[PDB]
Design a protein around this ligand. Structure first.
Ligand SMILES: Nc1ncnc2c1ncn2[C@@H]1O[C@H](COP(=O)(O)OP(=O)(O)O)[C@@H](O)[C@H]1O
Ligand SMILES: Nc1ncnc2c1ncn2[C@@H]1O[C@H](COP(=O)(O)OP(=O)(O)O)[C@@H](O)[C@H]1O
Lengths: 328, 324
């Protein structure tokens, strides 16, 4: 049966071996803790708060192998000196991103905020904020040295700025930094749009609300929504042609399906999984996967029409190839 | 035998029991973490860095019972809008304390800094800072308490009384802090009244030095300190002395004596009493890190009298101080 096959798959492929999981988490926590001590007394005029961990590995949603996690770098934008403008209301015309503008320059002149140094054309540029972070914060740190204080080999990549942390003989955790600001209840991260011309836009952070929703639905049920997600994530991670699919896209297929099916008991796993499959296919066919949290946002918007067709073509072929889809 | 009484007094009175000290510290660390979450969600617009723990309980220097710790509240000041003026350069003439002045008010008007809201008469007032923090950072306690299964009671100055055990409680107080350039200041008012003055923070360097010295030696400097703290905590006539005064007595003695091996404790302990008496007779205990600061400038004449008397007498019967 498909039910057995899926549970077998989760167990032999999707589920991260516990030792691996524990050691990767420990290295992240230990590095985050050491950075907290180190940075606390270092950049006294910078509105910088403690870095903190975020991502599927932190949430028990990472699959196959523990290989990555984020350190969010929370920055403070002072009261009433800043506003965010939704992307769809800018000429850039992209929902799910925001411009951040310096407000009241005419009364609290350029110079008033620490972040004025990262202001360009009146806007707080996420790439200039990220450059400042890398040069001023990350740069003040000897990475291989901290790994030596802790007992890890830490290698900063020369390529986007990430840390490769060997936590096991032949296993490494890749850590990347996400500068973040919050305006009202709008949480923004500097993860650039795929294309350069959009590099002035901060990205709206969806993950915390997405994963909260998913968890809250399963707690109430108590359903197999997260198990289904982890399985689909493992298939995509394990299939190169499915490389363009993200955890957010898969999570939102499941959240939409949650509006249509209330019953996610353990024995419904197979039916829901197949539903999630045909559903993902139909969104690809439509070229649009609306965010379950903010339906103005199209989660496929950074993919090209050709990429979207290739994904759908791949999934259709997979239906007749359960053995490759469910390796190993 | 003095040696014996000191060693036994450390274990019998000064050393906090292990369960108590771990639970109390862990409670502080747990509340500190939740605070981070509240600031993240509820105060994204206040230029405050994350609060962090500070004090003897965090340093394994607390004695007798785990009953208090501080959370530093680190304000972020623009380097171009603020300066600190050293107390000795003021008519008030108070070394070890600073004024924090708002600079360039005509070019950058009120509002150019979040912290302008805590300015009075052109200076950043620790009072309004504490008020603001208490008013604004008071949208957050029983949820943090239920979460950690601690009962948490905020005082109606704002401090937290945390029941971490049936018959024990930890009192957490908040210490506003600003750092300008290389200078770290805390809102801990002069004990004897210039309450516009911030205090130069000496504790981190003081304790780091004491630790460094013992670490190199496996010496008994910290042991001697904790015994002295316990005695003062236990002896009303001696309660006027602070951990910092006692720590600095020890730092100065460490400059004079190289041997702090375990059996030197009794001798170093007596030297510390006699040191106290000599600084008392001078009315001056300079900070070992910043000798222009007189740590005894915060003691009253009546306190200096009682301390001196109590200590002179004790020198003939040191063990009287080692009451069970
Ligand atoms: N707080 C956050 N806000 C926005 N994006 C985040 C946050 N934390 C992690 N991410 C992003 O989430 C993505 C990783 O998704 P994740 O849920 O970890 O699934 P996966 O296990 O497939 O990596 C990355 O693009 C990363 O930048
Ligand atoms: N970072 C700091 N800078 C300056 N003073 C501090 C700091 N942290 C704590 N203090 C002060 O230290 C005093 C407590 O001293 P501590 O070393 O904890 O000894 P004790 O155990 O006797 O309380 C309090 O007045 C508190 O405000």
């Amino acid at each position: 049966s498909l039910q057995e096959k899926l549970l077998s798959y989760y167990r032999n492929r999707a589920a991260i071996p516990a030792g691996e999981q524990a050691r990767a988490k420990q290295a992240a926590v230990d590095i985050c803790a050491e950075l907290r001590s180190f940075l606390r007394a270092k950049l006294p005029d910078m509105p910088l708060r403690d870095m903190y961990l975020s991502g599927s590995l932190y949430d028990d949603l990472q699959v196959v192998t523990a290989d990555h996690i984020q350190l969010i770098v929370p920055l403070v934008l002072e009261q009433n000196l800043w506003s965010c403008i939704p992307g769809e209301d800018t000429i850039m015309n992209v929902p799910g991103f925001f411009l951040v503008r310096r407000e009241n320059p005419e009364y609290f002149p350029r110079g008033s905020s620490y972040w004025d140094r990262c202001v360009v054309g009146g806007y707080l540029s996420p790439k200039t904020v990220a450059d400042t972070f890398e040069k001023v914060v990350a740069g003040s740190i000897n990475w291989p040295a901290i790994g030596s204080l802790l007992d890890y080999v830490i290698r900063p990549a020369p390529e986007a700025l990430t840390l490769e942390v060997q936590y096991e003989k032949d296993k490494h955790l890749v850590i990347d930094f996400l500068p973040s600001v919050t305006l009202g209840d709008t949480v923004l991260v500097a993860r650039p749009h795929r294309l350069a011309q959009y590099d002035n836009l901060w990205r709206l952070s969806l993950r915390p609300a997405e994963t909260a929703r998913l968890r809250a639905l399963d707690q109430a049920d108590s359903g197999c929504r997260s198990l289904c997600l982890k399985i689909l994530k493992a298939i995509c991670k394990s299939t190169p042609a499915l490389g363009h699919l993200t955890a957010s896209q898969l999570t939102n297929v499941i959240l939409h399906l949650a509006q249509e099916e209330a019953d996610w008991s353990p024995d419904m796993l197979a039916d829901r999984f197949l539903q999630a499959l045909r559903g993902l296919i139909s969104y690809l066919e439509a070229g649009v996967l609306p965010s379950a949290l903010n339906p103005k946002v199209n989660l496929f918007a950074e993919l090209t029409p050709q990429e979207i067709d290739e994904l759908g073509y791949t999934l259709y072929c997979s239906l007749s190839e359960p053995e490759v889809l469910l390796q190993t």
